[PDB]
Amino acid sequence: AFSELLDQVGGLGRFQVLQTVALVVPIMWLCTQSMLENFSAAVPSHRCWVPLLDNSTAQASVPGALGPEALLAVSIPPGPNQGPHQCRRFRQPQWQLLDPNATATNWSEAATEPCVDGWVYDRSTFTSTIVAKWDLVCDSQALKPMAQSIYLAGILVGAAVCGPASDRFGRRLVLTWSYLQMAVSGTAAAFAPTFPVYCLFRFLVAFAVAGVMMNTGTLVMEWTSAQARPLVMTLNSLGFSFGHVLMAAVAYGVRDWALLQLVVSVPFFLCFVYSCWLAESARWLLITGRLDRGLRELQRVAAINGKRAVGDTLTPQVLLSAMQEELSVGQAPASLGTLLRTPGLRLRTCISTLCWFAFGFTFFGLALDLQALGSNIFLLQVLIGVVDIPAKIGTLLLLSRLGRRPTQAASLVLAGLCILANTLVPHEMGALRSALAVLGLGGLGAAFTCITIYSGELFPTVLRMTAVGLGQMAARGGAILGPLVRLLGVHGPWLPLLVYGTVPVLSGLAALLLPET
Ligand SMILES: CC(C)(Sc1nc2ncccc2n1Cc1ccc(Br)c2ccccc12)C(=O)O
C-alpha cells in the first residue's frame, strides 16, 4: 500500500516473517522441478540387443561356458574410442574375432546391421530412466534436448500470460491457481504412457512455474517496507540456491523416473492448501477500485501484527485521502516507442539485453547437461548448491566497496573463462574438471545477481520497468535457445562447451563500455 498506511499497519512484524517463511519454501521445489532433468533423463550405456546373450537357450546350447566379455566381441563391432558400437550389431556371429591373436581392425561395422530387436541398458546406477523407457537413443538422440527446450518454452509463454492476468484478477488468486496446476501436472506426468503426453505435461508445469515465480516476487515486494526490499529479495534468491542441495539430497534416495517426479511434485498440494490464508496485497486492491476488501485486509493484517487500536481507527475517508497521490497520476506503462528511439540510450539497452541473453543461454545450456561437466552428478549438484551461496553473498559486498561495472565484467569474464578451461584439461583429472565447472557455475550465478541490480539503476525511473522486462524476455529466449546447441555434439562434445565458454567472455568484455552506476 501507500507508505503512510503501511507504516501505520507496521513495516516489519509477525505477518512479514510468516509470509516470507511460507513463500520461500516452495522456491526450493521450484528449483528441484527445473533441475529434475539431470536425474530423470540420464543416458546410460546402451548396447544392442543380441540373441546369443539375452536368450539363455542359445548361450546354454554351446558346450561349456564362454565369458561374457569374450562372447560380446563376436556380435558387436568395435566402436569408436575402444568400445562397443552403440547402435550396430553383427548380421551373423563371427568366431574368427574370438581368437585374440587376430587383429580386430578387419572386424568392423561395414557388414553390420541396425538395432532391430532393441537396446539393452544398464541398471547399476539408475533403475529406470525416460531414455531407457522410450528408446531416446541413436536416431532418437536429438529428441532428448528437444524435451529440455519445450519445457523452457513454457516458461516464456507463462510470463506472457501471467503478466496481464495477474494484473486483472489479483496476485494471490494467480499464485494459488499456479500451485494447483503445478501439483496436478507434476502428478500426471509420472503416468504418461507416450512421449508427447509427457512433453505436454512438462510444458504445462513450466507455465505454472513461471506464474509462481512472478507472483511470489510481486507479492513479497509489495508488502515489505521500503527499507528492507533488497534484503528480502536476496533471501528469495538464496532459497532457489538451496533448491540445488535439496535436489541432490532427494535424487540419491529414489532411483526412478516416475517416483522421483511424483515425490518432487506432490508437496504442491499442501502448498495450495495452506495458500488460502495469505493476504491479497492492498496496494493492488485500492488502485483498481477495490476499496472495501482492501480496507478489510489492512485491518486483518493490523490485528495480526499486534496493533489493534490503530487498525480500528482506520476509515475509508482517510484511506481515500492517503492514496490520492497514486490515483491522480495513473502511471501507464510506456511502450518501447519512447525507449529505442533516443539514439543516446541505444547502447545501454543493447548491452544490457546482451548480458541478460548471455547468462540466460549459457547457464541453462551448461547446467542441464551436468554429466559432461564432471564425473558423478550428485557431487556436482551438491557443490553447485553449496558454492552458489557464498558468491551471492560476496557480490553484494563487492558492489558496496567496488563499482558495479568492473564487478559485472570480471564476474562474467571469469565464469566464461573457467567454463572454457574446463574442456581443454584432460579427462584423467576428474577432480580439477569438476572444480572448474563448479567455479564457472558460481561465477554465472554471481553475474546474474549483479546484473539484476545493475539493470535498474542505468535507466530513468519511468523507463526502468520496460528495460527490465526486455532483459527478462531476452534472458528467457536465450535459455530456450541454449539446449538446442547440443545438436552439434555429433562432431564432438567439445564444440558445445567451446561455444558456452566463448559467449560469456565476449558478453563480459562488451559490458565494460556502458557507464558506471
Ligand atoms: C524468481 C526466483 C526463483 S529468482 C532466481 N535466482 C536465480 N539464481 C540463479 C539461477 C536461477 C535463479 N532464479 C530463478 C530464475 C532466474 C532466471 C531465469 Br531465466 C530462470 C529460468 C528458469 C527458472 C528459474 C529462473 C525467485 O527468487 O523467486
- Atom number of ligand 1 nearest to Cα 30: 3
Asked whether the beta carbons of 264 and 250 are under 8 A apart, the reply is yes
Asked whether the beta carbons of 122 and 137 are under 8 A apart, the reply is no
Q: How far is CA 356 from CA 172, 245, 448, 469, in A?
A: 28, 25, 8, 11
Query: Does 127 map to a domain?
Result: no
Instruction: For residue 110, give the H/E element and its range.
Output: none
- Atom number of ligand 1 nearest to Cα 155: 22
Query: In this structure, are 326 and 349 located in the same domain?
Result: no
Q: What are the backbone angles phi and psi of residue 33, rounded to the nearest 5°?
A: -60, -45
Asked whether the beta carbons of 137 and 87 are under 8 A apart, the reply is yes
Q: Where are the alpha helices (DSSP H) in 224-252?
A: 229-251
List the grid coordinates of 254: 529414489
* Alpha-carbon span 435 to 72, nearest angstrom: 37
Query: In this structure, are 18 and 65 located in the same domain?
Result: no
CB-ligand 1 contact for 507 (6 Å cutoff): no
Candidates 240, 247, 357, 444: which one to mutate for ligand 1, based on the most atoms within 8 Å of Cβ?
A: 240
Query: Does 376 map to a domain?
Result: yes
Give the three-state DSSP class for 99.
coil
Q: Domain containing 436 — which CATH number?
A: 1.20.1250.20
CB-ligand 1 contact for 213 (6 Å cutoff): yes
Q: Where are the alpha helices (DSSP H) in 36-142?
A: 37-40, 51-54, 56-61, 68-73, 130-134
Candidates 31, 156, 213: which one to mutate for ligand 1, based on the most atoms within 8 Å of Cβ?
A: 213
Long-range CB contacts (< 8 A, 24+ apart) of 337-344? Answer: 338/463, 339/463, 339/466, 339/467
- Centre of ligand 1 to C-alpha 432, Å, is 28
* Alpha-carbon span 402 to 345, nearest angstrom: 24
Residue nearest to atom 5 of ligand 1 (CA): 237
* Alpha-carbon span 430 to 289, nearest angstrom: 61
List the grid coordinates of 123: 541398471
Query: In this structure, are 201 and 346 located in the same domain?
Result: no
Burial of residue 207 (CB within 10 Å: 0-12, 13-18, 19+) is buried
Asked whether the beta carbons of 356 and 471 are under 8 A apart, the reply is yes
Cβ-based neighbour number of residue 134 at 10 Å? 17
Grid coordinates 525511473 are at which residue? 461
Burial of residue 226 (CB within 10 Å: 0-12, 13-18, 19+) is exposed
Grid coordinates 536416431 are at which residue? 139
CB-ligand 1 contact for 362 (6 Å cutoff): no
Query: In this structure, are 292 and 387 located in the same domain?
Result: no
Query: Does 126 map to a domain?
Result: no
Instruction: For residue 510, give the H/E element and its range.
Output: helix 494-510
Q: Which amino acid is at 159?
A: A
Query: In this structure, are 376 and 462 located in the same domain?
Result: yes
- The strand pairing partners of 47, in sequence order, are 120
- Atom number of ligand 1 nearest to Cα 472: 19
Query: Does 409 map to a domain?
Result: yes
CB-ligand 1 contact for 148 (6 Å cutoff): no
Q: Which amino acid is at 369?
A: D
Instruction: For residue 227, give the H/E element and its range.
Output: none
- Centre of ligand 1 to C-alpha 299, Å, is 34
Residue nearest to atom 6 of ligand 1 (CA): 237
List the grid coordinates of 491: 562432431
CB-ligand 1 contact for 474 (6 Å cutoff): no
**Could you tell me the resolution of this structure in angstroms?**
2.5
Candidates 237, 368, 451, 480: which one to mutate for ligand 1, based on the most atoms within 8 Å of Cβ?
A: 237
Query: In this structure, are 87 and 236 located in the same domain?
Result: no
CB-ligand 1 contact for 439 (6 Å cutoff): no
Q: Rounded to the nearest 10 degrees, how much is the dihedral formed by the CA atoms of 216, 219, 223, 224?
A: 30
Asked whether the beta carbons of 253 and 174 are under 8 A apart, the reply is no
Query: In this structure, are 282 and 390 located in the same domain?
Result: no
Give the three-state DSSP class for 89.
strand
- Centre of ligand 1 to C-alpha 329, Å, is 33
Q: Where are the alpha helices (DSSP H) in 14-104?
A: 14-35, 37-40, 51-54, 56-61, 68-73
Query: Does 125 map to a domain?
Result: no
Q: How far is CA 407 from CA 21, 253, 398, 402, 450, in A?
A: 31, 39, 7, 7, 8
Q: Which of 254, 144, 161, 156 is nearest to 199 (CA)?
A: 144
Total domains in the chain come to: 3
Query: Does 467 map to a domain?
Result: yes
Q: Please give the radius of gyration of the chain, using alpha carbons only, rounded to the nearest integer.
A: 28
* Alpha-carbon span 444 to 448, nearest angstrom: 6
Among candidate residues 297, 312, 330, the one where a domain is terminated:
330
Query: Does 377 map to a domain?
Result: yes
CB-ligand 1 contact for 272 (6 Å cutoff): no
Cβ-based neighbour number of residue 510 at 10 Å? 17
Query: In this structure, are 375 and 517 located in the same domain?
Result: yes
Asked whether the beta carbons of 496 and 489 are under 8 A apart, the reply is yes
CA end-to-end span of the chain, whole Å? 29
* Alpha-carbon span 252 to 264, nearest angstrom: 13
Q: What is the 3-state secondary structure (H, E, C) of 314-374?
A: CCHHHHHHHCHHHHHCCCCCCCHHHCCCCHHHHHHHHHHHHHHHHHHHHHHHHHHCHHHHC
- Centre of ligand 1 to C-alpha 353, Å, is 17
Q: How far is CA 272 from CA 218, 256, 257, 292, 355, in A?
A: 18, 26, 24, 26, 35
Contacts of 99 (CB under 8 A, 6+ apart): none
- Atom number of ligand 1 nearest to Cα 34: 23
Query: In this structure, are 355 and 497 located in the same domain?
Result: yes
- The strand pairing partners of 276, in sequence order, are none
* Alpha-carbon span 275 to 277, nearest angstrom: 6
- The strand pairing partners of 83, in sequence order, are 79
- Centre of ligand 1 to C-alpha 123, Å, is 33
Query: In this structure, are 284 and 369 located in the same domain?
Result: no
Residue nearest to atom 10 of ligand 1 (CA): 445
Among candidate residues 304, 330, 356, the one where a domain is terminated:
330
Residue nearest to atom 9 of ligand 1 (CA): 445
- Centre of ligand 1 to C-alpha 394, Å, is 18
Query: Does 415 map to a domain?
Result: yes
Pairing of strands 119-120, 47-48: antiparallel
- Atom number of ligand 1 nearest to Cα 239: 27
Query: In this structure, are 112 and 137 located in the same domain?
Result: no
Query: In this structure, are 57 and 77 located in the same domain?
Result: yes
CB-ligand 1 contact for 475 (6 Å cutoff): yes
- The strand pairing partners of 113, in sequence order, are 89
- Centre of ligand 1 to C-alpha 236, Å, is 10
Among candidate residues 270, 297, 330, the one where a domain is terminated:
330
Instruction: For residue 36, give the H/E element and its range.
Output: none
- Domain span at 62: 47-120
Q: How far is CA 267 from CA 41, 214, 243, in A?
A: 22, 20, 14
